[PDB]
Amino acid sequence: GSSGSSGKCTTREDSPKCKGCFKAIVAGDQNVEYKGTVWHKDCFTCSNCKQVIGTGSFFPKGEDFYCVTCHETKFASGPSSG
Ligand SMILES: [Zn+2]
Ligand SMILES: [Zn+2]
């Protein structure tokens, strides 16, 4: 997929770096930090529908992230015939 998984970490970092865009993230800005990593309120997207979730509630799965809805219809119950 992507040939470039070399460490070569940096001396130090005083800011939460992003994973989607790979751009340093700040506080004032709306983002989603989970277990360290942090995705900009706009970067944080779904894995199924692929829709910017952002601050909005979500459901992180094994090597993926399902937004509330997706998880609401995927796992959680719901009226199929509305
Ligand atoms: Zn980002
Ligand atoms: Zn979704």
mmCIF file with all atom_site columns, N, CA and C in Angstrom, residues 29-76:
data_model
loop_
_atom_site.group_PDB
_atom_site.id
_atom_site.type_symbol
_atom_site.label_atom_id
_atom_site.label_alt_id
_atom_site.label_comp_id
_atom_site.label_asym_id
_atom_site.label_entity_id
_atom_site.label_seq_id
_atom_site.pdbx_PDB_ins_code
_atom_site.Cartn_x
_atom_site.Cartn_y
_atom_site.Cartn_z
_atom_site.occupancy
_atom_site.B_iso_or_equiv
_atom_site.pdbx_formal_charge
_atom_site.auth_seq_id
_atom_site.auth_comp_id
_atom_site.auth_asym_id
_atom_site.auth_atom_id
_atom_site.pdbx_PDB_model_num
ATOM 1   N N  . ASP A 1 29 ? -8.348  24.617 18.114 1.00 0.00 ? 29 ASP A N  1
ATOM 2   C CA . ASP A 1 29 ? -8.985  23.964 16.977 1.00 0.00 ? 29 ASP A CA 1
ATOM 3   C C  . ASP A 1 29 ? -9.724  22.704 17.417 1.00 0.00 ? 29 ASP A C  1
ATOM 4   N N  . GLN A 1 30 ? -10.855 22.431 16.773 1.00 0.00 ? 30 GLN A N  1
ATOM 5   C CA . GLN A 1 30 ? -11.656 21.258 17.101 1.00 0.00 ? 30 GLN A CA 1
ATOM 6   C C  . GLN A 1 30 ? -11.061 20.001 16.474 1.00 0.00 ? 30 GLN A C  1
ATOM 7   N N  . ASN A 1 31 ? -10.668 19.053 17.320 1.00 0.00 ? 31 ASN A N  1
ATOM 8   C CA . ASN A 1 31 ? -10.082 17.804 16.850 1.00 0.00 ? 31 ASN A CA 1
ATOM 9   C C  . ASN A 1 31 ? -10.587 16.622 17.671 1.00 0.00 ? 31 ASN A C  1
ATOM 10  N N  . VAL A 1 32 ? -10.149 15.422 17.305 1.00 0.00 ? 32 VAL A N  1
ATOM 11  C CA . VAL A 1 32 ? -10.555 14.212 18.008 1.00 0.00 ? 32 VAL A CA 1
ATOM 12  C C  . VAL A 1 32 ? -9.344  13.380 18.416 1.00 0.00 ? 32 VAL A C  1
ATOM 13  N N  . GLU A 1 33 ? -8.973  13.470 19.689 1.00 0.00 ? 33 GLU A N  1
ATOM 14  C CA . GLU A 1 33 ? -7.830  12.726 20.205 1.00 0.00 ? 33 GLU A CA 1
ATOM 15  C C  . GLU A 1 33 ? -8.278  11.418 20.849 1.00 0.00 ? 33 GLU A C  1
ATOM 16  N N  . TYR A 1 34 ? -7.752  10.306 20.345 1.00 0.00 ? 34 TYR A N  1
ATOM 17  C CA . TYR A 1 34 ? -8.100  8.990  20.869 1.00 0.00 ? 34 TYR A CA 1
ATOM 18  C C  . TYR A 1 34 ? -6.855  8.127  21.043 1.00 0.00 ? 34 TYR A C  1
ATOM 19  N N  . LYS A 1 35 ? -6.574  7.749  22.285 1.00 0.00 ? 35 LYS A N  1
ATOM 20  C CA . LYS A 1 35 ? -5.414  6.920  22.591 1.00 0.00 ? 35 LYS A CA 1
ATOM 21  C C  . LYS A 1 35 ? -4.139  7.545  22.035 1.00 0.00 ? 35 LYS A C  1
ATOM 22  N N  . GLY A 1 36 ? -4.028  8.864  22.157 1.00 0.00 ? 36 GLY A N  1
ATOM 23  C CA . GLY A 1 36 ? -2.854  9.559  21.663 1.00 0.00 ? 36 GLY A CA 1
ATOM 24  C C  . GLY A 1 36 ? -3.120  10.299 20.367 1.00 0.00 ? 36 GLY A C  1
ATOM 25  N N  . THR A 1 37 ? -3.195  9.555  19.268 1.00 0.00 ? 37 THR A N  1
ATOM 26  C CA . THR A 1 37 ? -3.444  10.147 17.959 1.00 0.00 ? 37 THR A CA 1
ATOM 27  C C  . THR A 1 37 ? -4.585  11.157 18.021 1.00 0.00 ? 37 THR A C  1
ATOM 28  N N  . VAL A 1 38 ? -4.631  12.050 17.039 1.00 0.00 ? 38 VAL A N  1
ATOM 29  C CA . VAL A 1 38 ? -5.673  13.069 16.979 1.00 0.00 ? 38 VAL A CA 1
ATOM 30  C C  . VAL A 1 38 ? -5.980  13.459 15.539 1.00 0.00 ? 38 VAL A C  1
ATOM 31  N N  . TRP A 1 39 ? -7.256  13.402 15.176 1.00 0.00 ? 39 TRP A N  1
ATOM 32  C CA . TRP A 1 39 ? -7.683  13.751 13.825 1.00 0.00 ? 39 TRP A CA 1
ATOM 33  C C  . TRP A 1 39 ? -8.512  15.030 13.829 1.00 0.00 ? 39 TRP A C  1
ATOM 34  N N  . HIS A 1 40 ? -8.082  16.011 13.042 1.00 0.00 ? 40 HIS A N  1
ATOM 35  C CA . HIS A 1 40 ? -8.786  17.286 12.954 1.00 0.00 ? 40 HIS A CA 1
ATOM 36  C C  . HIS A 1 40 ? -10.290 17.067 12.825 1.00 0.00 ? 40 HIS A C  1
ATOM 37  N N  . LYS A 1 41 ? -11.065 17.916 13.492 1.00 0.00 ? 41 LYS A N  1
ATOM 38  C CA . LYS A 1 41 ? -12.519 17.818 13.454 1.00 0.00 ? 41 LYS A CA 1
ATOM 39  C C  . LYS A 1 41 ? -13.008 17.540 12.035 1.00 0.00 ? 41 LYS A C  1
ATOM 40  N N  . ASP A 1 42 ? -12.195 17.906 11.052 1.00 0.00 ? 42 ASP A N  1
ATOM 41  C CA . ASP A 1 42 ? -12.544 17.695 9.652  1.00 0.00 ? 42 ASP A CA 1
ATOM 42  C C  . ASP A 1 42 ? -11.835 16.464 9.096  1.00 0.00 ? 42 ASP A C  1
ATOM 43  N N  . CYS A 1 43 ? -10.654 16.175 9.633  1.00 0.00 ? 43 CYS A N  1
ATOM 44  C CA . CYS A 1 43 ? -9.873  15.025 9.190  1.00 0.00 ? 43 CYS A CA 1
ATOM 45  C C  . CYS A 1 43 ? -10.532 13.720 9.624  1.00 0.00 ? 43 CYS A C  1
ATOM 46  N N  . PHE A 1 44 ? -10.933 13.658 10.890 1.00 0.00 ? 44 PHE A N  1
ATOM 47  C CA . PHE A 1 44 ? -11.577 12.467 11.432 1.00 0.00 ? 44 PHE A CA 1
ATOM 48  C C  . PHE A 1 44 ? -12.794 12.080 10.597 1.00 0.00 ? 44 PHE A C  1
ATOM 49  N N  . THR A 1 45 ? -12.642 11.037 9.786  1.00 0.00 ? 45 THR A N  1
ATOM 50  C CA . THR A 1 45 ? -13.727 10.565 8.935  1.00 0.00 ? 45 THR A CA 1
ATOM 51  C C  . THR A 1 45 ? -14.085 9.119  9.252  1.00 0.00 ? 45 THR A C  1
ATOM 52  N N  . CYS A 1 46 ? -15.193 8.651  8.686  1.00 0.00 ? 46 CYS A N  1
ATOM 53  C CA . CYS A 1 46 ? -15.648 7.284  8.908  1.00 0.00 ? 46 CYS A CA 1
ATOM 54  C C  . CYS A 1 46 ? -14.907 6.309  7.996  1.00 0.00 ? 46 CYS A C  1
ATOM 55  N N  . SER A 1 47 ? -15.002 5.022  8.313  1.00 0.00 ? 47 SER A N  1
ATOM 56  C CA . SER A 1 47 ? -14.339 3.990  7.525  1.00 0.00 ? 47 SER A CA 1
ATOM 57  C C  . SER A 1 47 ? -15.327 3.305  6.586  1.00 0.00 ? 47 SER A C  1
ATOM 58  N N  . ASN A 1 48 ? -16.606 3.350  6.946  1.00 0.00 ? 48 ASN A N  1
ATOM 59  C CA . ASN A 1 48 ? -17.651 2.733  6.138  1.00 0.00 ? 48 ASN A CA 1
ATOM 60  C C  . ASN A 1 48 ? -18.200 3.721  5.113  1.00 0.00 ? 48 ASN A C  1
ATOM 61  N N  . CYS A 1 49 ? -18.895 4.744  5.601  1.00 0.00 ? 49 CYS A N  1
ATOM 62  C CA . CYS A 1 49 ? -19.475 5.759  4.729  1.00 0.00 ? 49 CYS A CA 1
ATOM 63  C C  . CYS A 1 49 ? -18.426 6.789  4.321  1.00 0.00 ? 49 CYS A C  1
ATOM 64  N N  . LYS A 1 50 ? -17.403 6.945  5.155  1.00 0.00 ? 50 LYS A N  1
ATOM 65  C CA . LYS A 1 50 ? -16.331 7.895  4.882  1.00 0.00 ? 50 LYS A CA 1
ATOM 66  C C  . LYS A 1 50 ? -16.845 9.330  4.953  1.00 0.00 ? 50 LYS A C  1
ATOM 67  N N  . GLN A 1 51 ? -17.465 9.678  6.075  1.00 0.00 ? 51 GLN A N  1
ATOM 68  C CA . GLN A 1 51 ? -18.001 11.020 6.268  1.00 0.00 ? 51 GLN A CA 1
ATOM 69  C C  . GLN A 1 51 ? -17.373 11.687 7.486  1.00 0.00 ? 51 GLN A C  1
ATOM 70  N N  . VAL A 1 52 ? -16.846 12.892 7.290  1.00 0.00 ? 52 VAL A N  1
ATOM 71  C CA . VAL A 1 52 ? -16.216 13.637 8.373  1.00 0.00 ? 52 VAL A CA 1
ATOM 72  C C  . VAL A 1 52 ? -17.055 13.574 9.644  1.00 0.00 ? 52 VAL A C  1
ATOM 73  N N  . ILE A 1 53 ? -16.532 12.894 10.659 1.00 0.00 ? 53 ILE A N  1
ATOM 74  C CA . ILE A 1 53 ? -17.232 12.760 11.930 1.00 0.00 ? 53 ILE A CA 1
ATOM 75  C C  . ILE A 1 53 ? -16.899 13.917 12.866 1.00 0.00 ? 53 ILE A C  1
ATOM 76  N N  . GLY A 1 54 ? -15.609 14.212 12.998 1.00 0.00 ? 54 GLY A N  1
ATOM 77  C CA . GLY A 1 54 ? -15.180 15.296 13.863 1.00 0.00 ? 54 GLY A CA 1
ATOM 78  C C  . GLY A 1 54 ? -15.610 15.093 15.302 1.00 0.00 ? 54 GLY A C  1
ATOM 79  N N  . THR A 1 55 ? -15.645 16.181 16.067 1.00 0.00 ? 55 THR A N  1
ATOM 80  C CA . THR A 1 55 ? -16.038 16.117 17.468 1.00 0.00 ? 55 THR A CA 1
ATOM 81  C C  . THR A 1 55 ? -17.188 15.138 17.673 1.00 0.00 ? 55 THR A C  1
ATOM 82  N N  . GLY A 1 56 ? -18.116 15.114 16.720 1.00 0.00 ? 56 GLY A N  1
ATOM 83  C CA . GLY A 1 56 ? -19.254 14.218 16.815 1.00 0.00 ? 56 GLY A CA 1
ATOM 84  C C  . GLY A 1 56 ? -18.873 12.852 17.348 1.00 0.00 ? 56 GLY A C  1
ATOM 85  N N  . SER A 1 57 ? -19.809 12.204 18.034 1.00 0.00 ? 57 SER A N  1
ATOM 86  C CA . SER A 1 57 ? -19.564 10.885 18.605 1.00 0.00 ? 57 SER A CA 1
ATOM 87  C C  . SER A 1 57 ? -19.271 9.865  17.508 1.00 0.00 ? 57 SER A C  1
ATOM 88  N N  . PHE A 1 58 ? -18.434 8.883  17.829 1.00 0.00 ? 58 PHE A N  1
ATOM 89  C CA . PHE A 1 58 ? -18.071 7.845  16.871 1.00 0.00 ? 58 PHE A CA 1
ATOM 90  C C  . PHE A 1 58 ? -17.833 6.514  17.577 1.00 0.00 ? 58 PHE A C  1
ATOM 91  N N  . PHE A 1 59 ? -17.529 5.483  16.796 1.00 0.00 ? 59 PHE A N  1
ATOM 92  C CA . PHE A 1 59 ? -17.279 4.155  17.344 1.00 0.00 ? 59 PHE A CA 1
ATOM 93  C C  . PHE A 1 59 ? -16.041 3.528  16.709 1.00 0.00 ? 59 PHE A C  1
ATOM 94  N N  . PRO A 1 60 ? -14.890 3.680  17.381 1.00 0.00 ? 60 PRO A N  1
ATOM 95  C CA . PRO A 1 60 ? -13.617 3.137  16.903 1.00 0.00 ? 60 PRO A CA 1
ATOM 96  C C  . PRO A 1 60 ? -13.572 1.614  16.976 1.00 0.00 ? 60 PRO A C  1
ATOM 97  N N  . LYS A 1 61 ? -13.288 0.979  15.844 1.00 0.00 ? 61 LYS A N  1
ATOM 98  C CA . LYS A 1 61 ? -13.212 -0.475 15.780 1.00 0.00 ? 61 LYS A CA 1
ATOM 99  C C  . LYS A 1 61 ? -11.790 -0.933 15.470 1.00 0.00 ? 61 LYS A C  1
ATOM 100 N N  . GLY A 1 62 ? -11.599 -2.247 15.398 1.00 0.00 ? 62 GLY A N  1
ATOM 101 C CA . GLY A 1 62 ? -10.286 -2.790 15.108 1.00 0.00 ? 62 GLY A CA 1
ATOM 102 C C  . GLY A 1 62 ? -9.725  -2.282 13.794 1.00 0.00 ? 62 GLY A C  1
ATOM 103 N N  . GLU A 1 63 ? -8.768  -1.363 13.876 1.00 0.00 ? 63 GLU A N  1
ATOM 104 C CA . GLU A 1 63 ? -8.151  -0.794 12.683 1.00 0.00 ? 63 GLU A CA 1
ATOM 105 C C  . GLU A 1 63 ? -9.193  -0.105 11.808 1.00 0.00 ? 63 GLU A C  1
ATOM 106 N N  . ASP A 1 64 ? -10.087 0.647  12.442 1.00 0.00 ? 64 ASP A N  1
ATOM 107 C CA . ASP A 1 64 ? -11.135 1.359  11.722 1.00 0.00 ? 64 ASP A CA 1
ATOM 108 C C  . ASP A 1 64 ? -11.916 2.274  12.662 1.00 0.00 ? 64 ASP A C  1
ATOM 109 N N  . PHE A 1 65 ? -12.862 3.021  12.102 1.00 0.00 ? 65 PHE A N  1
ATOM 110 C CA . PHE A 1 65 ? -13.677 3.939  12.890 1.00 0.00 ? 65 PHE A CA 1
ATOM 111 C C  . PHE A 1 65 ? -15.062 4.101  12.274 1.00 0.00 ? 65 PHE A C  1
ATOM 112 N N  . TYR A 1 66 ? -16.078 3.616  12.978 1.00 0.00 ? 66 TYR A N  1
ATOM 113 C CA . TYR A 1 66 ? -17.452 3.704  12.500 1.00 0.00 ? 66 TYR A CA 1
ATOM 114 C C  . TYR A 1 66 ? -18.211 4.811  13.223 1.00 0.00 ? 66 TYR A C  1
ATOM 115 N N  . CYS A 1 67 ? -18.760 5.745  12.453 1.00 0.00 ? 67 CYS A N  1
ATOM 116 C CA . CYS A 1 67 ? -19.513 6.858  13.018 1.00 0.00 ? 67 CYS A CA 1
ATOM 117 C C  . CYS A 1 67 ? -20.777 6.362  13.715 1.00 0.00 ? 67 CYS A C  1
ATOM 118 N N  . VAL A 1 68 ? -21.272 7.152  14.664 1.00 0.00 ? 68 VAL A N  1
ATOM 119 C CA . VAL A 1 68 ? -22.476 6.794  15.404 1.00 0.00 ? 68 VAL A CA 1
ATOM 120 C C  . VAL A 1 68 ? -23.481 6.081  14.507 1.00 0.00 ? 68 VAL A C  1
ATOM 121 N N  . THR A 1 69 ? -24.029 6.814  13.542 1.00 0.00 ? 69 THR A N  1
ATOM 122 C CA . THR A 1 69 ? -25.005 6.252  12.617 1.00 0.00 ? 69 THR A CA 1
ATOM 123 C C  . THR A 1 69 ? -24.597 4.853  12.170 1.00 0.00 ? 69 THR A C  1
ATOM 124 N N  . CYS A 1 70 ? -23.505 4.771  11.418 1.00 0.00 ? 70 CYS A N  1
ATOM 125 C CA . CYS A 1 70 ? -23.009 3.492  10.926 1.00 0.00 ? 70 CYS A CA 1
ATOM 126 C C  . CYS A 1 70 ? -23.091 2.422  12.012 1.00 0.00 ? 70 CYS A C  1
ATOM 127 N N  . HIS A 1 71 ? -22.636 2.768  13.212 1.00 0.00 ? 71 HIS A N  1
ATOM 128 C CA . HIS A 1 71 ? -22.660 1.839  14.336 1.00 0.00 ? 71 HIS A CA 1
ATOM 129 C C  . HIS A 1 71 ? -24.084 1.634  14.842 1.00 0.00 ? 71 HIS A C  1
ATOM 130 N N  . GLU A 1 72 ? -24.929 2.640  14.638 1.00 0.00 ? 72 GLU A N  1
ATOM 131 C CA . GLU A 1 72 ? -26.319 2.569  15.077 1.00 0.00 ? 72 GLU A CA 1
ATOM 132 C C  . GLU A 1 72 ? -27.106 1.574  14.229 1.00 0.00 ? 72 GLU A C  1
ATOM 133 N N  . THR A 1 73 ? -26.764 1.496  12.947 1.00 0.00 ? 73 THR A N  1
ATOM 134 C CA . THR A 1 73 ? -27.439 0.587  12.029 1.00 0.00 ? 73 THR A CA 1
ATOM 135 C C  . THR A 1 73 ? -26.672 -0.722 11.888 1.00 0.00 ? 73 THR A C  1
ATOM 136 N N  . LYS A 1 74 ? -25.350 -0.643 12.007 1.00 0.00 ? 74 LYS A N  1
ATOM 137 C CA . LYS A 1 74 ? -24.500 -1.823 11.895 1.00 0.00 ? 74 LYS A CA 1
ATOM 138 C C  . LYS A 1 74 ? -24.676 -2.737 13.103 1.00 0.00 ? 74 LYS A C  1
ATOM 139 N N  . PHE A 1 75 ? -24.299 -2.238 14.277 1.00 0.00 ? 75 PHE A N  1
ATOM 140 C CA . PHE A 1 75 ? -24.416 -3.011 15.507 1.00 0.00 ? 75 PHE A CA 1
ATOM 141 C C  . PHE A 1 75 ? -25.742 -2.726 16.206 1.00 0.00 ? 75 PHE A C  1
ATOM 142 N N  . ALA A 1 76 ? -25.847 -1.545 16.806 1.00 0.00 ? 76 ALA A N  1
ATOM 143 C CA . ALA A 1 76 ? -27.061 -1.149 17.508 1.00 0.00 ? 76 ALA A CA 1
ATOM 144 C C  . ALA A 1 76 ? -28.302 -1.475 16.683 1.00 0.00 ? 76 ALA A C  1
#
